[PDB]
Amino acid sequence: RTQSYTNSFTRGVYYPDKVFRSSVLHSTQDLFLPFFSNVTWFHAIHNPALPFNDGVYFASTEKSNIIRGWIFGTTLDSKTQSLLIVNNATNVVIKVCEFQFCNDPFLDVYANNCTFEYVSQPFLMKNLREFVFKNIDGYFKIYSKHTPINLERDLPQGFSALEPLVDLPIGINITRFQTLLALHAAAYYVGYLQPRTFLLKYNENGTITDAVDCALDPLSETKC
Amino acid sequence: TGVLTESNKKFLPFQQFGRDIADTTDAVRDPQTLEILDITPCSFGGVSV
Ligand SMILES: *[C@@H]1O[C@H](CO)[C@@H](O)[C@H](O)[C@H]1NC(C)=O
Ligand SMILES: *[C@@H]1O[C@H](CO)[C@@H](O)[C@H](O)[C@H]1NC(C)=O
Numbered sequence A: 001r002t003q004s005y006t007n008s009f010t011r012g013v014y015y016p017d018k019v020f021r022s023s024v025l026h027s028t029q030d031l032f033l034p035f036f037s038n039v040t041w042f043h044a045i046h047n048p049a050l051p052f053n054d055g056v057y058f059a060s061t062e063k064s065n066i067i068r069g070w071i072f073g074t075t076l077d078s079k080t081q082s083l084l085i086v087n088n089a090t091n092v093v094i095k096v097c098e099f100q101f102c103n104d105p106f107l108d109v110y111a112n113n114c115t116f117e118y119v120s121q122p123f124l125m126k127n128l129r130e131f132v133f134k135n136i137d138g139y140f141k142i143y144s145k146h147t148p149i150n151l152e153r154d155l156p157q158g159f160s161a162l163e164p165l166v167d168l169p170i171g172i173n174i175t176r177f178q179t180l181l182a183l184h185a186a187a188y189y190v191g192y193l194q195p196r197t198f199l200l201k202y203n204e205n206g207t208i209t210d211a212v213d214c215a216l217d218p219l220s221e222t223k224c
Numbered sequence B: 001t002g003v004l005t006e007s008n009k010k011f012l013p014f015q016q017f018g019r020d021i022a023d024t025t026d027a028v029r030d031p032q033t034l035e036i037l038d039i040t041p042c043s044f045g046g047v048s049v
Helices: A218-223
Strands: A005-007 A025-032 A038-042 A056-060 A131-135 A144-147 A164-166 A188-192 A194-201 A210-213 B017-019 B025-029 B036-038
Touching: A210 A218
Parallel strands: none
Antiparallel strands: A005 A038, A025 A194, A038 A188, A056 A131, A056 A188, A131 A144, A144 A164, A194 A210, B017 B025, B025 B036
């Protein structure tokens, strides 16, 4: 696949807690995406997998209903730990698949252990639409979280929010990371999170409007 | 301890509490029915003779 490069452009600020705050300049220390970082612009037409290095910021600008799910796991081959997420559009199941189910992974359309059968709602949800994800492993419970957006560019100028979506309390030692396409051209972005201190700005609503990365440049250190 | 009243604050559906600067709760969500109710301690002050 084609490995292009793009800067992150102050995108990926997320809610760190389940607590309403209003008009408070609260400063948090969580695993965020650093400002102006080289995210990758994988053009999927061709395939080894991606690392999961303390959380993966996933973004995709597809509208034609191509992106489906991911195979967050460790080794994905056989007989090992193999507790791999079989994250899908609605079936977020933690089956040990041993070998690769659904043939080679392209989602064709036209024994050991039988545990952790977690089943939930539709996980995700008229010209363009951008999906933003911030999958962290964290402390035991995997946090997967999604926000919408209106305008679509190559990670455009603006600030967004999080609205956390699921809180699955299962998953052990995820290091490798995959992506499902729809084959009967994806162009998705991948960013890697690092432990940094942020300074979040709320408003009269409960809404993070701005953020300051407290170790980017000395002006931001003065502001923090 | 405190008085309770209805709230005009619009909680997001994933939020539960509301915190203050001194780490005390400002508003809480009722667990039985989904309504937001404020937290404010009862009236107090000094007494001068
Ligand atoms: C991201 O990595 C590529 C790899 O060579 C590099 O060319 C680019 O300058 C990096 N972006 C930075 C340092 O902002
Ligand atoms: C807070 O949310 C309400 C509900 O939509 C909105 O009408 C109001 O303008 C918001 N306050 C702002 C944007 O300052």
